[PDB]
Design a protein around this ligand. Sequence first.
Ligand code: ATP
Ligand code: ATP
Lengths: 392, 390
Amino acid sequence: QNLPSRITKLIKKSESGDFASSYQLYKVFGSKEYGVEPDEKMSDYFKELSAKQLEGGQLRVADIHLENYKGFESLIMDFSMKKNSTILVGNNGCGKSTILDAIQKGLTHLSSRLSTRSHNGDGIEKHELRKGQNYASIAINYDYMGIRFPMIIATTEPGYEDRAKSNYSGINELGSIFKTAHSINPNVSFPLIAMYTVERANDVSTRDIENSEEIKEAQIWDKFKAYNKSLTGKADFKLFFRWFKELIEIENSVNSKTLHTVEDAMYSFLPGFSNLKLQRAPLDLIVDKNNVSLSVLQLSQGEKTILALIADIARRLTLLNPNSVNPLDGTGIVLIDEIDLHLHPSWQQNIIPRLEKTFKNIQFIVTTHSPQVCHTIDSQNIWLLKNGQKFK
Amino acid sequence: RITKLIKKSESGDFASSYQLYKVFGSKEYGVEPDEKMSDYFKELSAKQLEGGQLRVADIHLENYKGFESLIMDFSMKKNSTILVGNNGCGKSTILDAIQKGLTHLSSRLSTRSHNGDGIEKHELRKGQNYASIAINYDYMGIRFPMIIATTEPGYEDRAKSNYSGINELGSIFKTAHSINPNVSFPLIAMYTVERANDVSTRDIENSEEIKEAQIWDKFKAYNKSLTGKADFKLFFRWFKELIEIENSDNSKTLHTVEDAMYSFLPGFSNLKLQRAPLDLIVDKNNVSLSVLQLSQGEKTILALIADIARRLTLLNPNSVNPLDGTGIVLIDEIDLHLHPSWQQNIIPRLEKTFKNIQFIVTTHSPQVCHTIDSQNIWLLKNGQKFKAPK
Ligand SMILES: Nc1ncnc2c1ncn2[C@@H]1O[C@H](COP(=O)(O)OP(=O)(O)OP(=O)(O)O)[C@@H](O)[C@H]1O
Ligand SMILES: Nc1ncnc2c1ncn2[C@@H]1O[C@H](COP(=O)(O)OP(=O)(O)OP(=O)(O)O)[C@@H](O)[C@H]1O
């Protein structure tokens, strides 16, 4: 056990509280880092101590690399930690969808370890190669508490299995730490993994959800539920209707404050609304339109899309985050594709600042076309694209 | 007996021919109702509509949706009108009223004889009890009234329904069909905010509803046209039929409909068909992708233009140029899935390719209203028709 003074310094820092030192030492003991060599059988008091001191960490992507995916030949994107917002502006032909929907592939594999069954969700498909190459690769570097996590989703084509191979060596531990933390305590907060594609507005209506619509089955409202159907890109308002019914039925303070917080999440957004109630009789959900009357089946599609999006995000953050003062302060990644979809042009100047105002702990990697989306965004947050190339 | 109105009897244009039915037929006011030249004039005013145009004159909305009362006169000299506004002002309400009137018009024009949609419970203003959707049509200078109005029961008939004009329009079109079985039926279609959504080839095969033989006639263009979905699967089936004939040649329709799509696209070419997986080939920048392998903005417009081209192709069978048809085509959210720069060429390409189609479109992007006449812009802000034509 050759112990440098750095080992003792990191040990003292870990006692004071720092996940980074704990995970670094858990790698050190059992390896050759500063010698030492395997001392304990496994995770003596280092990985378990990290799991105990697992709180407040943000699951944020830091570096992605595309190699012959979609129409590209090579791409090296660089996000940042101090800024919780990434906006990808370009045109149809210069792929920012091949950035968002290239990160969702790795996010599916992370979802299938974070809290679900361990299984490979998506891989690189033949309709994804650049019509003529044989090797493809997407690399993602998750950064939790300041420690990197490699990902290689590289595929192969027959006859060329020599330099491309998948390596899930970081997400095999990023989820294991969370499982250990959940073993330590049951009320730990897991991050949110979510993508929202162009199809957000699809299936947002109370058509027959008061009747046979496949939600009639009993529902288990645990922490693992919010991870189901998250990376399909469709906002679930029908399930929000089920949750809203259940919470108000129980309401008739801890069982009531959730709906108040979720509703105030929307009220801080698109204005003029208050006192949203249901219809026990076979009518539609009712919401105010500057205090006369209105229902949800009769709305504007900007209202509809914003309502569905924010309802889904708030409901998943409430499920994922256990009893806490502010359940909406959860961490994770929320991918919004085509954010400039059905919003009046005076909204595409406040949609992003309010998203990072109310839900102010989640990185938002969004894609847009209208320049007005960038009107409230610094120049360093913007990534222009042209002919498979990235400009500042 | 007869005044100088023998002028209109000088075999005048369709305006005079139709005006010599209402008078000079029945009504016993002007000339004795002989009833013979009335039938002869109905027969005459069927071949006269060789180069006619169908537009919408003006609409009256009263308590339908948010609008308490609004009257706008759609200019007919210009073949395009734009309804710019924010969200919550009533751009789609104006379009949805015309879509509930065009349903009744298509019910008479198509092989249908029954009626269509109507005002229902939810689509009536909160507090009031009578609705009013009056759409006045014009066909070669003749004005055709319409009133789709219904009211809640218990009141002394404050509103009623009158369907006089569209019956006459359908009658004259049917009479035109009886003589020459190609009379350039006007196109009726709304394109809602949910175009595309079915422009993927992930599933198109023998396992879906597009498997039975479908009759290609001018009445086929009225199926699901007002629903608001770009029926790309049926276009794929039609394209398979047309390419099969070209392979059987061992057919200028395909060239025309394909050149219609290339014009709207900045460097797309060479649409062919894959036989094994059944998906469409497209060549951008001379690298061959597949129809599913584009952007949503490069697929929505592809489906939209392909659909419009095929509807005019079936609707004007024997015309030398099938795209020179007439219609009341509506697009909601034209700026959807478009560049800040492609929102410029979107209107002129429609104007050049479709020179006799009226486009009552809605948008909220300022970049769409460039190079467009200022007197065709309807800013429906608040609850009126505040116009900014300078
Ligand atoms: N009594 C009412 N009935 C129906 N709608 C009403 C009523 N009162 C107010 N409204 C409002 O009128 C609004 C209609 O606004 P509008 O037509 O501009 O939507 P839109 O943004 O144009 O839709 P689209 O994107 O499809 O074009 C509804 O959102 C609805 O909230
Ligand atoms: N397998 C491929 N081979 C060659 N080129 C491809 C391939 N896949 C995609 N491309 C091209 O690369 C471009 C990038 O694709 P994509 O459409 O997803 O970008 P995008 O316009 O930003 O999408 P969105 O509008 O949803 O944001 C496409 O326009 C497409 O033409």
